[PDB]
Amino acid sequence: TGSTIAEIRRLRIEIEKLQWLHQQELSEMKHNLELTMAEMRQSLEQERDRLIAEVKKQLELEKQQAVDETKKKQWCANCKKEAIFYCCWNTSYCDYPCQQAHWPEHMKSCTQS
Amino acid sequence: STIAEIRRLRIEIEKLQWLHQQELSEMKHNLELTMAEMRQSLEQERDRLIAEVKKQLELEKQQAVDETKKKQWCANCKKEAIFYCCWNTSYCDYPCQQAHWPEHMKSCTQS
Ligand SMILES: [Zn+2]
Ligand SMILES: [Zn+2]
Ligand SMILES: [Zn+2]
Ligand SMILES: [Zn+2]
C-alpha cells in the first residue's frame, strides 16, 4: 500500500498509452492501405498502356522501312525472290526456271512484243 | 515482493509489445512480397499479350511487303510508277523522271 498503489497506477498509465497508440495504427491503416494498393495498380497499367503503344509505333516504323526498301528492287513474278532477268513491264525473274515455269500463266499478259 | 512482481509485469508487457510490432512488420513484409509478385505475374501476362500483337503486326508487315513486290514504284517519289526508263527505274510522270535525271543519268542502262 502506497508504493504498490503508486506502481499499479503506473501500470495503468502504461497500458492506457499502449491502447491509444494501437488505436492510431488501426484507425490509420484501414485508410492508408486503401490508397497504396490502388496507387500501385494504376501505375502498373499506365506503364502497360505506354508499352503497347511503344511497340505499335515501333513496328509501324519497321513496316514502312521494309515496304520502302521493297520499292527499290525488282522481284520475281514467279517466286517473289529478288529478280535479275527482265521480260516486260512489271515482269522480272530470279532465273530462267522461274521464267520458264511462269510462262504458261504469263503468256496471256506478256507485253514484250 | 509485490513491488517486484509489478515491475516484472511491466517488463513482460513491453516485451509483448515488441512481439506485437514484429508481427505487424512481418505482415507488412508479406504484403510486399505478395505485392511485388502481383506486378510480376501481371507483367508476365502483359508480355505474353505483347507477343501476340507483335505476331499480328509482323504478319501485316509481310502482307504489305508482298503487295509492294507486285507493283512498279517511282525511283524519285515512291508513288506507283507508270513510265519505264530502264532496269529497276520507273517514274510516275515526267516531272519525277526529269527531277531524277541529274542523278540517274550515270546509271541509266536505257536500251
Ligand atoms: Zn523466281
Ligand atoms: Zn513478258
Ligand atoms: Zn514520282
Ligand atoms: Zn534509265
- Identity of the residue in B39, B46, B68 whose CB atom sits nearest the CB atom of A67: B68
Compute the nearest-CA separation of A97 from chain B (Å): 19
Contacts of A3 in chain B (CB under 8 A): 3
Answer yes or no: are the C-beta atoms of A68 and A53 closer than 8 Å: no
- Sole residue written with cell 508479406: B30
Contact yes or no for A51 and B50 at CB 8 A: yes
Q: What experiment produced this structure? A: X-ray
How close are the terminal C-alpha atoms of chain A, in Å? 129
Q: Of A44, A69, A55, nearest to B36 (Cα)?
A: A44
Q: What angle do CA B69, B67, B48 make, to 5 degrees?
A: 115
Helices marked H in B70-106: 94-104
Q: Is B96 annotated as a binding residue?
A: yes
B-chain residue closest to A51, CA distance: B50
CA atoms of A44 and A103, how far apart (whole Å): 58
Burial class (CB in 10 A: 0-12, 13-18, 19+), A113: exposed
Which cell is B92 given? 510516275
What DSSP element (H or E) covers B91? strand B89-91
Structural domain boundaries in chain B: 1-70, 72-111
| Grid cell at residue A29 | 491503416
* Cβ-Cβ contacts under 8 Å for A109 (sequence gap 6 or more): A91
Query: What's phi and psi for B50, nearest 5 deg?
Result: -50, -40
| H runs (alpha helix) in chain A | 3-71, 96-106
Among chain B residues, the shortest Cα distance to A44 is held by B39
**C-beta atoms of A63 and B66 within 8 A:** no
Of the candidates B2, B69, B84, the beta carbon closest to that of A75 is on B69
CB within 8 Å: A63 and B68: no
Contacts of B85 in chain A (CB under 8 A): none
**Cα B94 from Cα B98, distance rounded (Å):** 6
Resolution, Å (one decimal): 2.3
Query: In angstroms, rounded to a whole number, what is the distance separating the alpha carbons of residues A109 and A106?
Result: 5
